[PDB]
Design a protein around this ligand. Structure first.
Ligand SMILES: Cc1cc2nc3c(=O)[nH]c(=O)nc-3n(C[C@H](O)[C@H](O)[C@H](O)COP(=O)(O)O)c2cc1C
Length: 147
């Protein structure tokens, strides 16, 4: 099994979440390729991968903005190879805002309409993910079961 994890992180919280999911998948025997969205290229990005996990933090406060590094990839998601691809999404936000983790919904919706296969409901972390380390580890185990 080959997994790709692509994350957008401004203060490092979704990055830490992606490091935690990557270690759980690697420990299970998966080959994991983890990339920061600041430097990936959308075209053909998902091709070759059995599983693709997209992480992105929510910003915006009065409206939904995706983490700034992620916006180019999200804008190019039709070009990635998402149709028929098993995917799931994750991100950090704060439930005191009106659209809590609205970036994870936006990316899930977009993937669904592209004919991707969402294998697990998105992981939406409220607060410091270092304080939710066990729900992250749990969701990573769940996604492996869903493929
Ligand atoms: C000015 C500001 C606005 C934010 N807006 C939202 C929001 O609209 N929804 C949400 O869930 N979280 C929101 N957040 C919380 C960030 O998503 C949270 O701090 C997250 O941990 C950042 O993850 P990152 O380090 O991976 O980019 C906001 C934070 C700040 C400082």
């Amino acid at each position: 099994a080959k997994a790709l994890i692509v994350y957008g992180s401004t203060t490092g919280n979704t990055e830490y979440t992606a490091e935690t999911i990557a270690r759980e998948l690697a420990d299970a025997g998966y080959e994991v390729d983890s990339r920061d969205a600041a430097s990936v290229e959308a075209g053909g990005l998902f091709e070759g991968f059995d599983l693709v996990l997209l992480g992105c933090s929510t910003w915006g406060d009065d409206c939904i903005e995706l983490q700034d590094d992620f916006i180019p990839l999200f804008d190019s998601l039709e070009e990635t190879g998402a149709q028929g691809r098993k995917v799931a999404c994750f991100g950090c936000g704060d439930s005191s805002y009106e659209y809590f983790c609205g970036a994870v919904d936006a990316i899930e919706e977009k993937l669904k309409n592209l004919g991707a296969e969402i294998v697990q409901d998105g992981l939406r972390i409220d607060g410091d993910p270092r304080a939710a380390r066990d729900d992250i580890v749990g969701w990573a185990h769940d996604v492996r079961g869903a493929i």
